[PDB]
Design an enzyme around this catalytic site. Structure first.
Site, mmCIF file in Angstrom:
data_model
loop_
_atom_site.group_PDB
_atom_site.id
_atom_site.type_symbol
_atom_site.label_atom_id
_atom_site.label_comp_id
_atom_site.label_asym_id
_atom_site.label_seq_id
_atom_site.Cartn_x
_atom_site.Cartn_y
_atom_site.Cartn_z
ATOM 1 N N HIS A 158 16.074 20.624 68.842
ATOM 2 C CA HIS A 158 16.624 19.594 67.872
ATOM 3 C C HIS A 158 15.976 19.729 66.689
ATOM 4 C CE1 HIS A 158 19.358 18.833 71.243
ATOM 5 N NE2 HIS A 158 18.878 17.709 71.409
ATOM 6 N N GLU B 134 25.441 7.446 74.451
ATOM 7 C CA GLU B 134 26.364 7.787 73.357
ATOM 8 C C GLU B 134 27.308 8.982 74.259
ATOM 9 O OE1 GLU B 134 26.056 8.979 69.082
ATOM 10 O OE2 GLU B 134 26.640 10.484 70.132
ATOM 11 N N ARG C 155 17.583 9.375 51.296
ATOM 12 C CA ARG C 155 16.176 9.966 50.350
ATOM 13 C C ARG C 155 16.857 11.442 50.172
ATOM 14 N NH1 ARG C 155 13.360 13.221 54.038
ATOM 15 N NH2 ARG C 155 14.182 12.693 56.259
ATOM 16 N N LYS D 249 19.711 0.939 62.840
ATOM 17 C CA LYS D 249 20.830 1.872 63.194
ATOM 18 C C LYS D 249 22.111 1.168 63.635
ATOM 19 C CE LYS D 249 19.599 6.013 63.862
ATOM 20 N NZ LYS D 249 20.574 5.785 62.482
HETATM 21 N N1 LIG Z 1 25.811 13.648 71.526
HETATM 22 C C1 LIG Z 1 25.097 13.878 70.569
HETATM 23 N N2 LIG Z 1 25.649 13.415 69.276
HETATM 24 C C2 LIG Z 1 24.806 13.726 68.111
HETATM 25 N N3 LIG Z 1 23.899 14.260 67.904
HETATM 26 C C3 LIG Z 1 23.507 14.491 68.966
HETATM 27 C C4 LIG Z 1 23.877 14.547 70.460
HETATM 28 N N4 LIG Z 1 23.237 14.898 71.330
HETATM 29 C C5 LIG Z 1 22.161 15.549 70.627
HETATM 30 N N5 LIG Z 1 22.350 15.316 69.370
HETATM 31 C C6 LIG Z 1 21.188 15.970 68.118
HETATM 32 O O1 LIG Z 1 20.619 14.597 67.945
HETATM 33 C C7 LIG Z 1 20.178 14.845 66.315
HETATM 34 C C8 LIG Z 1 21.008 13.687 65.508
HETATM 35 O O2 LIG Z 1 20.393 13.459 64.238
HETATM 36 P P1 LIG Z 1 19.303 12.430 64.281
HETATM 37 O O3 LIG Z 1 18.534 12.493 65.640
HETATM 38 O O4 LIG Z 1 19.451 11.379 63.619
HETATM 39 O O5 LIG Z 1 18.002 12.948 63.242
HETATM 40 P P2 LIG Z 1 17.906 13.097 61.807
HETATM 41 O O6 LIG Z 1 17.827 11.699 61.177
HETATM 42 O O7 LIG Z 1 16.847 14.040 61.236
HETATM 43 O O8 LIG Z 1 19.221 13.807 61.224
HETATM 44 C C9 LIG Z 1 20.751 16.325 65.941
HETATM 45 O O9 LIG Z 1 19.604 17.069 66.163
HETATM 46 C C10 LIG Z 1 21.791 16.476 67.077
HETATM 47 O O10 LIG Z 1 21.968 17.864 67.257
#
Ligand SMILES: Nc1ncnc2c1ncn2[C@@H]1O[C@H](COP(=O)(O)OP(=O)(O)O)[C@@H](O)[C@H]1O
Ligand SMILES: CC(=O)SCCNC(=O)CCNC(=O)[C@H](O)C(C)(C)COP(=O)(O)OP(=O)(O)OC[C@H]1O[C@@H](n2cnc3c(N)ncnc32)[C@H](O)[C@@H]1OP(=O)(O)O
Ligand SMILES: [Zn+2]
Ligand SMILES: [Zn+2]
Lengths: 380, 665, 190
Positions: free
Chosen positions: A235, A200, A292, A117
């Protein structure tokens, strides 16, 4: 094309791969553990073999050397990961390159870029996309606060190895930031072994947008429009959605355009997706890029009527997007679609799975209905 | 299905970007679909979807004019349903009653890496040097070659020759990889052919091929019987030559040739056929009877055997062997005979004997101390009584001597528990004697026949007293004048003792009024003279004038030209033609059974003989990577008919099977 | 004198020929009228027996008696190697009650020396005439049957007297583990 292909996966994705291979006239090979001898995918393949020891069924699928040896013994020419298990592990790609077996995937180098990441984020600033503030990954709390002293609050503290929505907390201030960060670090260390958590900026009321990218070997990238996955529970994705309603055409056009520009810059050679979050005022954040195929691709398959797995297999054989007919002046969505998944989770006692024997099964169908995966009466 | 309305089952619609994609998707859909229980029109649709004109789009009202679209046949060739039918039939209609817990012999096999190639053995040496060089090497080698007879001659005398191919094929790799020093293995011929065709519904050639593939470093030996190869009657020369050619082609390395009444001109064609091959070994055997060391032995003396051996050597024999089928060879007889044979001639000597009186290993020890080159041995769990001496005793009797065989004793001992479990499995077919019997010196009978004789006298009348059959066999042997019997002339004397005991003839009045009895036809056929001539002479100066005025002899029909045509080419056609020409009725039954129930030779003894039980799961191997997992769920009591429904599990799916219970009629 | 092990083996450093020779010398010093060798498990081989009998007959001036069991099978060979070197007397059990864990058959012993300079002088028909009575008597004693299925090769590793093996088989049938009998074998070895 390929004479034979081995599928190192389990479930409905294996059956989908088998169907796609049979449509292309390619033989299929399956591998199963002892504890999963009663699965359907074992009897849907031309040949099946047993792998692993008498215990640890999950660890059996995570064994690169055994799968490579089985593929070599069976005379296979390709290995299809699917989704999950070793679908993003670079050791499988390295082992495939070390032998005469081809790997169905983007490339070995692209897999290394997507794991840690934020070097994705380094590639997104370079490619020139709208990118959000990125925090320095650190397991220390004083350092995280020294970086957090200049932040637009509230803040999401996220596990570094966390993916899917496992291990993040929203803190509205910095007074409760240290305890929150300590809890997140402990949870990340217990979960994935990396005690580092990154902050973030927390964007208000977001909407999640997926863009699908298809690309060949010599270099040519096309997009299959957007999706919508806003409906989530803890989530976790729940219900999929057709092209996103209440979206203007300029918005979709520029999403598709910068997604394709990033995909072309990154040197991609297969299928995949890019994720964005859209807020009340509207902005692109570029959360990450999944290299993927997911379980929701069928949704786009219902609007663009383009086969994904068969096209992926033909791309892995060294075909460009010219003899396949996938050029961007006849691709237009028509209709809407949605997808749902049925699980054994009980919405009454928590959401934990329930085990038992199935005593009655009645399916459904008709106009505009597609079913993937099917058990049988008396199954356990 | 309701016989009142239409026959509509399911409508399948397939769509695509273009017509070829839709047609491929429909083909895949119609292939994946599976309907079992009723007859379906799927193959007609598959034939229509695979027409190049239909894919090109040249559709027309008269598209059906093409004929072979209709009768494409090849419906399903469904093997699982036939296996399930046979298993349910065995489960419901099992003749054997209740049983203890199921025994799995495979769990007793020792751990060994079955991946590495096995070390070179006797087949490499035979290929490198040839028959003459192999014989010279065996004559000049101080070690004494051990032959294994567990695969053919062990279960023949103890279990009525009813051991199937699964256990032999499962245990052959371990034998090939722990014991690379065995001279040869006997696993074909004798009575296994007829029993396999008749009682076990198997093909002997497939068994030979499986055993050849299993063991690539050890020679294979087969017991031929002169003119009558595996049957009981003389056969034409062309059949014998074809049989030798097919057998050496499938992998038979050594041919052991004997005859009931020891005489030349009855084994010359077989010897010539073996020698014509150029890659096989011929071992000619002389049958031993009586006691030559006795002062009053005026018929079976040393000179008789010496001229027999001289004729055999004149006939072009590669190995010379002595066959003892009743256990009548003593240490001193064996010493003198082996010494004389080794000093007169220049051929290796092979010794074969049975352990009916007990303690026959002494004979072996007296033979290899005088020149004997090779001996035979059966495995310990299937040794003793009417079988051959134990292998462990033979290996331990020469250890740390100049006659050392070189076989590890721990390796031979490690395989015994599997043989014990296998013998425990074959419980209903047990026919072994209580122990050693001294009486064999008076009523000399081959060990392989005594068990069936005991069962026949249990089940056909007088069973509390068994003496009468003994002195009746003695009397029948004395009437015909000291016959030399192994297979052919054993059954005639057995039937004659049977008739004698059933007719009240004490010992001698049969020779007074032969015409007033129901003499078995085998006896008349002996008296006719198609088995040759007796060694001592014709016992009929007063018995019968020519035949006692019975009649004439039946003609023999010449072979049909197509059979001679098919006998000249090598392949499965020749094997089928031999099977039908040798044993017509049982091979026709076997063909009907194989048509009805597919291939069942891959099943185990437990499934084949007993059936399916509840709570256990069985694995049956169809092809490489193609395995079937079978289990049972429940059984319903019979309806007003004799029909029951059995619910079973196949690959984790429920299956109802309708079966007939013949018990309630 | 009790016999154990295999003295003909190069690595036999305890039960060697000299040990038996001094044992026999002490026995002769003690005033023995007959000298005998007792084999209770069936561990005496033809060559061991030949060398031992020869040494005993050449060193001393006493008759030799040989006794052995037929657990491995085919122990009559040992007898034949012993009387060819000096052995004066042997033991024998009747045929219906011979073999397995019992002593070698009497008919075999009588027939192995007939018309030789070692002739015993016993009629063979006379010995054969008494077998049916022994067969009927053994059939009567059905509930107390404890014989083994046949000959076992494993006795070379877990040497046990023949008289005890039957009771061991019954004890392991009736006191727990009966499907698998190996554990008792390597436990006796240990
Ligand atoms: N501030 C934020 N910015 C981005 N995503 C967020 C935030 N807070 C919560 N999330 C959640 O984190 C997830 C971001 O995707 P991620 O964790 O990388 O999963 P994936 O790889 O399955 O897409 C989402 O479910 C999103 O709703
Ligand atoms: C795209 C797809 O997934 S479907 C394309 C068609 N091929 C397949 O379905 C792949 C595997 N299927 C088979 O092997 C089928 O038997 C076929 C279609 C190839 C041939 O079928 P048929 O000739 O009618 O029957 P066959 O003699 O092979 O019977 C084999 C039996 O073993 C089963 N079997 C077949 N392959 C396997 C395997 N690898 N493992 C376990 N069981 C198997 C079959 O299901 C069948 O049982 P059934 O009565 O439930 O069908
Ligand atoms: Zn024989
Ligand atoms: Zn004793």
């Amino acid at each position: 094309m390929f004479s034979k292909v081995l599928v190192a996966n389990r479930g409905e994705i294996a059956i989908r791969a088998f169907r796609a291979a049979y449509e292309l006239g390619v033989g299929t090979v399956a591998v199963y553990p002892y504890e999963d001898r009663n699965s359907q995918h074992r009897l849907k393949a031309d040949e099946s073999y047993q792998i692993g020891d008498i215990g640890h069924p999950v660890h059996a699928y995570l064994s690169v050397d055994e799968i490579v040896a089985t593929a070599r013994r069976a005379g296979a020419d390709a290995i299809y990961p699917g989704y999950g298990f070793l679908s993003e592990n670079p050791d499988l790609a390295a082992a495939c390159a070390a032998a005469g077996i081809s790997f169905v995937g983007p490339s070995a180098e692209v897999l290394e870029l997507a794991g840690n990441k934020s070097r994705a984020i380094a590639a997104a600033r370079e490619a020139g996309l709208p990118v959000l503030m990125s925090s320095a990954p650190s397991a220390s709390v004083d350092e995280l606060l020294s970086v957090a002293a200049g932040m637009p609050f509230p803040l999401f503290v996220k596990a570094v190895a966390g993916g899917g929505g496992r291990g993040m907390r929203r803190v509205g201030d910095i007074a409760a930031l240290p305890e929150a960060i300590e809890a997140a670090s402990r949870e990340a260390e217990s979960a994935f072994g990396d005690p580092t958590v990154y902050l973030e900026q927390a964007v208000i009321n977001p909407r999640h947008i997926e863009v699908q990218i298809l690309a060949d070997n010599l270099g040519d990238v096309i997009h299959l429009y957007e999706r919508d996955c806003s409906v989530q529970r803890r989530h976790q994705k729940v219900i999929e959605l057709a092209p996103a309603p209440h979206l203007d055409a300029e918005l979709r056009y520029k999403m598709c355009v910068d997604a394709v520009a990033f995909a072309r810059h990154i040197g991609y050679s297969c299928a995949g997706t890019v994720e964005f979050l859209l807020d009340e005022r509207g902005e692109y954040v570029f959360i990450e890029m999944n290299p993927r195929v997911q379980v929701e691709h069928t949704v786009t398959e219902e609007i663009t009527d383009v086969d994904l797995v068969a096209s992926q297999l033909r791309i892995a054989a060294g075909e460009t997007l010219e003899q396949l007919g996938l050029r961007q002046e006849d691709i237009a969505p028509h209709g809407a679609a949605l997808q749902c998944r049925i699980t054994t989770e009980d919405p009454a006692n928590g959401f934990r799975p329930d085990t038992g024997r199935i005593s009655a099964l009645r399916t459904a169908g008709g106009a505009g209905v597609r079913l993937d995966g099917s058990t049988n009466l008396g199954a356990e | 299905i309701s016989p009142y309305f239409d026959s509509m089952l399911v409508k399948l619609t397939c769509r695509g970007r273009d017509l070829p994609t839709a047609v491929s998707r429909a083909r895949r859909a119609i292939a994946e679909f599976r309907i079992r229980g009723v007859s379906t029109n799927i193959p007609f649709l598959q034939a229509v979807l695979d027409d190049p004109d239909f894919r090109a789009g040249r559709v027309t009202t008269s598209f059906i004019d093409e004929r072979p679209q209709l009768l494409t046949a090849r419906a399903s060739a469904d093997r699982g349903t036939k296996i399930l039918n046979f298993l349910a039939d065995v489960t419901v209609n099992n003749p054997y009653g209740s049983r203890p817990s199921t025994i799995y012999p495979d769990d007793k096999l020792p751990d060994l890496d079955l991946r590495a190639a096995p070390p070179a053995g006797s087949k490499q040496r035979l290929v490198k040097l040839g028959p003459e060089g192999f014989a010279r090497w065996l004559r000049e080698s101080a070690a004494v070659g051990v032959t294994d007879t567990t695969f053919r001659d062990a279960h023949q005398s103890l279990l009525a020759t009813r051991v199937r191919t699964s256990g032999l094929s499962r245990v052959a790799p371990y034998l090939a990889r722990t014991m690379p020093q065995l001279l040869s293995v006997e696993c074909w011929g004798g009575a296994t052919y007829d029993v396999a065709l008749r009682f076990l519904k198997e093909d002997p050639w497939e068994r030979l091929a499986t055993l050849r593939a299993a063991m690539p470093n050890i020679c294979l030996q087969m017991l031929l019987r002169g003119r009558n190869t595996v049957g009981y009657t003389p056969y034409p020369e062309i059949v014998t030559s074809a049989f030798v050619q097919e057998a050496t082609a499938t992998g038979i390395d050594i041919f052991r040739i004997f005859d009931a009444l020891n005489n030349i001109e009855s084994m010359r064609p077989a010897i010539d056929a073996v020698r014509e091959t150029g890659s096989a070994i011929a071992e000619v055997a002389m049958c031993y009877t009586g006691d030559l060391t006795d002062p009053g032995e005026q018929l079976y003396t040393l000179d008789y055997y010496l001229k027999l051996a001289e004729q055999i050597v004149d006939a072009g024999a590669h190995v010379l062997a002595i066959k003892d089928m009743a256990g009548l060879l003593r240490p001193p007889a064996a010493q003198r005979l082996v010494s004389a044979l080794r000093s007169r001639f220049d051929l290796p000597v092979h010794l074969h004997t049975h352990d009916t009186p007990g303690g026959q290993l002494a004979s072996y020890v007296a033979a290899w101390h005088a020149g004997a080159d090779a001996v035979d041995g059966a495995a310990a769990p299937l040794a003793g009584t009417t079988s051959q001496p134990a292998l462990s005793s033979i290996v331990a009797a020469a250890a740390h001597t100049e006659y050392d065989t070189g076989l590890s004793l721990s390796a031979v001992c490690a395989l015994e528990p599997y043989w014990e479990a296998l013998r425990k499995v074959y419980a209903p077919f047990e026919s072994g004697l209580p122990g050693p019997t001294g009486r064999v010196y008076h009523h000399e009978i081959p060990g392989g026949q005594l068990s069936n004789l005991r069962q026949q006298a249990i089940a056909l009348g007088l069973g509390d007293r068994f003496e009468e059959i003994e002195e009746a066999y003695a009397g029948a042997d004395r009437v015909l004048g000291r016959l030399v019997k192994v297979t052919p002339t054993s059954k005639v004397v057995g039937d004659l003792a049977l008739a004698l005991v059933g007719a009240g003839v004490s010992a001698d009045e049969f020779a007074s009024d032969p015409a007033r009895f129901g003499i078995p036809e085998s006896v008349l056929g002996f008296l006719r003279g198609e088995l040759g001539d007796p060694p001592g002479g014709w016992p009929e100066p007063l018995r019968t004038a020519a035949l006692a005025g019975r009649g004439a002899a039946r003609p023999t029909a010449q072979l049909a030209a197509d059979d001679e045509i098919a006998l000249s080419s090598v392949g499965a056609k020749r094997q089928a033609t031999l099977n039908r020409l040798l044993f017509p009725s049982p091979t026709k039954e076997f063909n009907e059974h194989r048509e009805a129930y597919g291939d069942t030779s891959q099943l185990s003894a437990n499934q084949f003989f007993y059936g399916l039980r509840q709570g256990e799961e069985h694995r049956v191997k169809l092809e490489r990577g193609v395995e079937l997992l079978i289990g049972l769920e429940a059984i319903s009591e019979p309806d007003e008919r004799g029909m029951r429904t059995v619910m079973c599990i196949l690959n984790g799916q429920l299956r109802p099977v309708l079966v007939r219970d013949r018990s309630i009629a």
